[PDB]
Amino acid sequence: STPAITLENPDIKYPLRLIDKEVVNHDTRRFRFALPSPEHILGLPVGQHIYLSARIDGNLVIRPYTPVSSDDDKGFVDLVIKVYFKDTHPKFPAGGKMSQYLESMKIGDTIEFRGPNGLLVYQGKGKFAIRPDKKSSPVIKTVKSVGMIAGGTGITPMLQVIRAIMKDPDDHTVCHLLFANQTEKDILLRPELEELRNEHSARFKLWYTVDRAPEAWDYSQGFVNEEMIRDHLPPPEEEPLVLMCGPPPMIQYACLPNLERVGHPKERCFAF
Numbered sequence: 091s092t093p094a095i096t097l098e099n100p101d102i103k104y105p106l107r108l109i110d111k112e113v114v115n116h117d118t119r120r121f122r123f124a125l126p127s128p129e130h131i132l133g134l135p136v137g138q139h140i141y142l143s144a145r146i147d148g149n150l151v152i153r154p155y156t157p158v159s160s161d162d163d164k165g166f167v168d169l170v171i172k173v174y175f176k177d178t179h180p181k182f183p184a185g186g187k188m189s190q191y192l193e194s195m196k197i198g199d200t201i202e203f204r205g206p207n208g209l210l211v212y213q214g215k216g217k218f219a220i221r222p223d224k225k226s227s228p229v230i231k232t233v234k235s236v237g238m239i240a241g242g243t244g245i246t247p248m249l250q251v252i253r254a255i256m257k258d259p260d261d262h263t264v265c266h267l268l269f270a271n272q273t274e275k276d277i278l279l280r281p282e283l284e285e286l287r288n289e290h291s292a293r294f295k296l297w298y299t300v301d302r303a304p305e306a307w308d309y310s311q312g313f314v315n316e317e318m319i320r321d322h323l324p325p326p327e328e329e330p331l332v333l334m335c336g337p338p339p340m341i342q343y344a345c346l347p348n349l350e351r352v353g354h355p356k357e358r359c360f361a362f
């Protein structure tokens with residue numbers, strides 16, 4: 091039999107109760123929410139995400155999140171969240187709306203989840219189903235490798251796919267991740283990524299860049315660029331699928347122009 095799914099209809103909002111909040115570091119949290127029963131699963135296909143919605147200071151706010159849990163987890167869903175506090179970043183004095191609202195929640199408070207959502211679904215063994223828009227059928231494409239470029243919070247869509255491939259010992263897809271962040275301190279999910287590299291190096295290639303580097307730094311510094319793409323994603327001759335998730339200026343200025351310079355078809359580079 092299969093477990094009961096939580097996300098039965100994508101137009102329904104499901105208020106889920108907050109049961110645990112881990113302080114991972116000063117500005118990183120893991121929030122665990124109970125599903126409707128301990129035996130439920132979320133019902134989130136690999137490749138897709140949920141939305142959280144709430145009335146925050148009187149206004150509706152909706153944001154996408156990819157859990158760090160999977161449909162293997164019974165009874166809960168986990169979100170890893172970067173909290174963007176006010177009065178930290180000079181360009182963002184107000185800080186972030188949903189992330190500060192999550193940080194404010196008390197154990198036992200609920201928040202609405204919806205899903206699944208997203209134009210890409212991973213069907214296993216290299217096969218991706220990608221819709222051009224929501225109203226259209228998917229193009230099924232089967233690849234031998236996947237380039238992944240994440241910035242900041244954009245890691246969790248990548249991690250979800252990486253995890254799904256590595257857990258299938260008969261999935262020979264090779265993932266190459268290039269992960270950009272502001273600083274070393276701001277990197278999310280580093281232990282988790284490095285665990286995967288330790289266990290699955292043949293199938294999982296990991297590289298970091300940081301806008302500004304620490305004194306002791308073994309990886310790249312600067313924004314994603316042509317060299318990093320040549321050095322840390324599969325070559326275009328191999329026809330990899332390229333996935334991206336990061337802030338709009340990163341995608342627009344750093345990723346697409348440089349994917350094109352290397353020769354990847356820019357039109358086929360998918361942004362979550």
Ligand SMILES: Cc1cc2nc3c(=O)[nH]c(=O)nc-3n(C[C@H](O)[C@H](O)[C@H](O)COP(=O)(O)OP(=O)(O)OC[C@H]3O[C@@H](n4cnc5c(N)ncnc54)[C@H](O)[C@@H]3O)c2cc1C
Nearest residue numbers: 154155156171172174178179182185186187188189243246
């Ligand atoms: C498919 C998908 C999955 C995602 N999964 C996750 C996830 O698992 N975890 C997660 O944390 N986010 C995730 N995100 C990002 C998430 O949707 C929100 O963008 C994020 O929570 C910030 O929203 P907010 O309402 O707090 O900030 P907003 O109010 O929307 O602020 C706008 C932007 O301002 C910038 N900003 C604000 N304050 C600061 C600051 N102090 N320093 C640096 N920049 C700042 C950030 O770039 C921010 O996104 C995902 C996004 C996508 C597209």
